[PDB]
Amino acid sequence: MRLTEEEVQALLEKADGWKLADERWIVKKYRFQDYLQGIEFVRRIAAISENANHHPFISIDYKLITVKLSSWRAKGLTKLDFDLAKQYDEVYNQMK
Amino acid sequence: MRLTEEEVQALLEKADGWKLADERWIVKKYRFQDYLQGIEFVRRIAAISENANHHPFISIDYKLITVKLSSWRAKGLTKLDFDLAKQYDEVYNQMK
């Protein structure tokens, strides 16, 4: 079930660091002090994503990891995207 | 030492899968049958990159891993970029 414009705005206001982009994606940048730690973060959130059968787009620009979420089957954002966003935030906070 | 246009063209002709992009970068796309295997590939080439004190840009679009190499200090491509390209190719071939 794709979230409406109003629902997306409401969820985004409670998701610090996540930004609406390309009209239907939420994007967050996670910075690390150690390059390999950024990689470990990627390894962990990838595992979580695979188990959720929901994969984000991830880019690794040295110590800056960019994560982009959206639901292609729903043609936009779903509650799952925001749930995963929080799960990724949790991993980041534990590592930091 | 930045490679000249002629040197880059010569090295690229012997680097299957690697393409010149954005004027001074070499880019390659590595496809996997398993999402987590693509992640493992990233983990391995990141380690190699960290030891070489030379980090590529990496993106993970589901099962497609894109790797982009260049030497910012040399303001272009260096022999090291092509050496790492071969090292990454080796990892990929071993995993496949």
Domain-wise residue ranges, chain A: 1-96
Amino acid at site B87: Q
Closest CA to A47 of B57, B67, B37: B37
Residue in this structure with the two tokens 């190699």, named with its chain if needed: B48
Contact B60/A46, CB-based, under 8 Å?
A: yes
Query: Which B positions 8-47 lie with beta carbon below 8 A of chain A?
Result: 35-36, 39, 42-43, 46-47
The fold of the B1-96 domain, in CATH, is Gyrase A; domain 2 (3.30.1360)
Cα dihedral B71→A92→A27→A54 (10° resolution): 110
The CA–CA distances, whole Å, from A1 to A7, A24, A34, A76 equal 12, 14, 38, 9
Q: Do A60 and B61 touch (CB under 8 A)?
A: no
Cβ-Cβ contacts under 8 Å for B37 (sequence gap 6 or more): B95
Closest CA to A89 of A3, A25, A24, A16: A16
